[PDB]
Design a protein around this ligand. Structure first.
Ligand code: CO
Ligand code: CO
Ligand code: CO
Ligand code: CO
Ligand code: MG
Ligand code: MG
Ligand code: MG
Ligand code: MG
Lengths: 387, 387, 387, 387
């Protein structure tokens, strides 16, 4: 079972299945993929769409003539397959000119170039039908404390995002921005290192409604944080515009394993949350097939991403549908959590003797939360050991 | 040298020097301190003031008569010494009734009790002259994924803080709230786990101007984050109302070492930032004298907190005053970071051929940032090896 | 299904189901359990046996008369139920006298007391039938660099273990020692912090054959290490005398969650390894029912430990029995890993032109390892989605 | 002051100052350095010697004729400068053929090639005067649990090191091996991940006397471990053959910052330990000048490594020479830690009533350890604030 179809909204970056396997300590183990081939292979696997950095699709430094040629080839493949392009992004991290950042480089001329490079790819993204434009500021940061005045850097980051918002507004584009946080790597510390920091920063931009977050499973886990909790906070704020699914084993370098690998229980609770909240954006995989693999392993790893999502969706749905779990949720008072604490108001609460003066603290304290029985029912459903 | 005086604004919680040394694996190693003794001993060391949880000062469950007696004794000590009380907080974590939280407990009656307990201590805090009321939601969280619906929990957290804001507003109190984040411990994950998450949450409250953050050095470091960077972002947003200084060696249990211990370079860059930004709130120490120590070691550890701040202040001031460092800052273009990227505007930037069409990317890329020479000058100043 | 019976060799510490819920920030949430009740409740759940610290069974400071009374009660419960006692240990961490360690306290008189306290419990352990005596040196360590000369401390640690080996040898006891590592908590750093460090230390003792390791799942994961890999190395060295099973979510305070919780895939690979290696010692649970729970939750959490082991055993057995997985193992050359590299010898290897001079490095490099397909078959078996 | 000279025994890998700045997300920012230039520039800075991987000095796949040419050029530079070559190593990680390991690749032909490549460089290393041959098994490991049978892999690792020991023994070379641990990166988990694991493994080799450890500051810190403690254990076992000095900020990707950067207090305690133990091997820097830097920054970063060692040496010497610190060491009973616990023997200890029956546990427990005052004296000396 568990066969993916375009309705499941699975998407992949060109840079994922196309990663050649160069890491900090070793050369490439796979040949370069033609983006046209990736589109066609991904359509056959059941993918909904692909995403791209500008430099994935058009080699850096291409003339206007070579650029048009690369885009026409790619567009021809999309038209042939029905594959969509729901998101695009800029590469502001690979070329040595960005070694101190794009939007927050100390050199002003680099920051201006960073903005012009980004604006050019927004035009292309809109033409191809992208609804979300992601920014991962992988070089915005520092290895040493004196290298970056962070208040000034946040001024420059705000300036850049405000100029991008003025640009899409003046052009009448119907595209929104999503900031992708990462705590570190390749810089010693990266600015806006978590979902929370990015959410707070958005609230100081001139047009906050145009901006949300693109959280990545492995990135929040690189700070030891609870990724489903962070996603819940983004949904609560109305800012989950896009999401990057993959796996990560704890606090270390960014692994970008296939989704389902790494923290399996966190993946179950994430899928439970996305599906119960009715998230309807792309389920995008930002993963790297390990460099141990040949090209057959690349496609097996990509298929595995989708398969694991579909298995977890089924288990989470069965968990929530189980009357025994519904009873367990009531026994742990999850339903009381949904009731207002004091809809009767501040005055009524102050004069309520049963909330303080006459509150029986020892009886309340003796009540068990029954959380372990609930969690073991969740474990049983995840493992298919109910029945 | 480095003798502290009240003008340095050093403050200590009653619960810091008063920690009896009970940890998860062992009994208390020190006798309980009388809060009156702590006030007098801290005044002799040069402290500006003390802070308190309600339960530090008034034993839980005290009658109105015993309560008034504990407060009069404490007030008499403050009047005798001139010690100030700039901040207070609620204990919503020790008593078993709070085992699933205060503001976000699943049980509604517990949430109501949590609010009444907090409101009662706000009245006392204002009477004693506190300007900041801190909330550390140490029990708000979960060990397992199904125990807490996080969107509902954030609704209840918002409800509680909005009711506290309505209360201080209706009473005409001149006190502000500061949320203290912590990523984990004693819960498996705590809600609002970092400075960023707390800053983002404040922006959804009804009266955001009343609320800021109380970041703690060790807590951000428990997520492997850069504490000076996080403080810079709080200052940039106008939300650094208070701060907890201590030390922490990496990602593990919350150590609350004396300030200066743990990550020494991060402490240098923090002091550099607080002093150059002109932060003027209390320099509050939330630390625990290790349970290896007797009472002489408690006071030596407390004196060490203040001493290390004063030494780092001197080194950071000398670093910024050094003409050789000023030259190094220009060589790394820290001054260009302060210039707007495009004050000429979006249209001018789009038509500027030198920002893209004619931008010499290879010349820009070849420029060294000279960050290592700058950082070694910082190291030399920290270690007193200049000259 | 998945009902435990005594043949599954599941054991529990008295201190596990008996944890009253006191953590660093809160009071106890459960009443104390009578060890006799724990024996009887654990026998009803299907447990094989119980383990104990001296101070769990005999309150500290008991006279010879009260001591004999506590032991007779406990012995009567064991005889009534058939429950076994396969392991015992000393509490050298709770009482304030041990605040700087037992075997490596700076104070010599404390080290002597630590040895006499331990020797007394070895006598009792042997009388009750224990085959393994565990030592967890939770207080051996330091918060600051100058407090402990670590070479001298390792001398004292070696001295203590050598004296214990001389004692059991002179008494003719048939009991072996197992060192339990932990990287930190309650000390800032603990000596012998991982399985590897403990294995290396054993090799410098006078009688290494008497000593092995008692690794704990969560403890190695507190250093971000791969617990199955560490267990493999202990088995390879012949030193896995005992094991502590529980769960842990990443690098933070020691959670001691029920087994199966935390890193679920690591638990699958651990059970796969223990069962395929034919480990035949106790499957011991060192876990804490969360303090949110009442007494019903305590027993549900304990039952969950055993249930999760039995489910994972079934899935791992089905994984290894699957002919499709056996084919995948050959495709990834797991079988070639078992062949000697050069049983033909050093001289033959030096003169083998096909190992270097004529080795086709590009053909070898192009071979895929097929690891992702293998790992997805493992995922399918863990989740019960094969068929 | 703090000028390095050859007597300080500072050494650098060719791959350190020669790192071109390629990281997982970006291209090279510096041109390649000619090894002859690196020798001459390092001699001018005051370095004692250089180290190399085979592939740093001889491009992979070179004929016997090109190989001899590269070696003669390098040898001519050494003879011209007096620079020594105290250590060499093999590159078994960069070429795609090693994507699953060298000594523990699943493919047997790769393991044989790995051994022949290593043996060839041992011959060259001895000819140039190296006394230590390092092995960093950076590709020995796995991203997924089924890919590697770790017991079989340790068999193959033991086989390889035993064959290398047979080879140097049969040739009569006076060179010893040092294993360099790393917990992860570039593999998801690396075999022998810490100093402890490597020390334990050495004890199972046929000729353990030929093998020790080459611990790296940042690598142990990637597991959150205390690097000075681990070095103490290696010295206690007689196995510290070599050491890699650099800096690392906590648990994340391997940063290889210049020595002194990262955890500054840990660097102070390390230098204190190396100097008080009389370690006399090379002080080798395995660091990467950040890719933000041009070639002037490369040499400033390299000079900074040596400068920071010399400053910390001076501060640690002054700390130990201070009569006030000696008094503090006695007050914390560091001297009692050096006394045997029970040189009177097991029988005397058993019959000593003052060690148990008459031991006054409450008086002992009340003694303060005075560790905080000692640590603040250490802080004062590190910062040059004594006097
Ligand atoms: Co990633
Ligand atoms: Co804290
Ligand atoms: Co534990
Ligand atoms: Co390194
Ligand atoms: Mg991503
Ligand atoms: Mg605090
Ligand atoms: Mg244990
Ligand atoms: Mg190294």
């Amino acid at each position: 079972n568990y066969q993916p179809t375009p309705e499941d909204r699975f998407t992949f970056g060109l840079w994922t299945v196309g990663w050649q396997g160069r890491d900090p300590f070793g050369d490439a183990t796979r040949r370069a993929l033609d983006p046209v081939e990736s589109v066609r292979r991904l359509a056959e696997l059941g993918a909904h769409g692909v995403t791209f950095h500008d430099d994935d699709l058009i080699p850096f430094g291409s003339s206007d003539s070579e650029r048009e040629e690369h885009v026409k080839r790619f567009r021809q493949a999309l038209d042939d397959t029905g594959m969509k392009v729901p998101m695009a992004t800029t590469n502001l991290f690979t070329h040595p000119v960005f070694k101190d950042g794009g939007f927050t480089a100390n050199d002003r001329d680099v920051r201006r170039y960073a903005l012009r490079k980004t604006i050019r790819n927004i035009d292309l993204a809109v033409e191809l039908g992208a609804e979300t434009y992601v920014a991962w500021g992988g070089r915005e940061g520092a290895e040493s404390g004196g290298a970056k005045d962070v208040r000034d850097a946040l001024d420059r980051m705000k300036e850049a995002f405000d100029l991008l918002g003025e640009y899409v507004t003046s052009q009448g584009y119907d595209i929104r921005f999503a900031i992708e946080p990462k705590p570190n790597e390749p810089r010693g510390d990266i600015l806006l290192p978590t979902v929370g920091h990015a959410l707070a920063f958005i609230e100081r931009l001139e047009r906050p409604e145009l901006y949300g977050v693109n959280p990545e499973v492995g990135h929040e886990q690189m700070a030891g944080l609870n990724f489903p909790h962070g996603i819940a906070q983004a949904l609560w704020a109305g800012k989950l515009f896009h999401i990057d699914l993959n796996g990560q084993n704890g606090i270390k370098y960014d692994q970008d394993l296939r989704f389902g690998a790494g923290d399996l229980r966190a993946a179950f609770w994430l899928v439970d949350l996305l599906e119960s909240a009715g998230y309807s954006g792309p389920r995008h995989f930002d993963f790297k097939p390990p460099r141990t693999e040949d090209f057959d392993g690349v496609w097996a790893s990509a298929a595995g991403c989708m398969r694991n999502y579909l298995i977890l969706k089924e288990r989470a749905a069965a968990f929530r549908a189980d009357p025994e779990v519904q009873e367990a949720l009531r026994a742990s008072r999850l339903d009381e959590l949904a009731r207002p604490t004091a809809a009767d108001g501040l005055q009524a609460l102050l004069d309520d003797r049963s909330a303080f003066e006459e509150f029986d603290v020892d009886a309340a304290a003796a009540r068990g939360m029954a959380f372990e029985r609930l969690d073991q029912l969740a474990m049983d459903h995840l493992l298919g050991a109910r029945g």
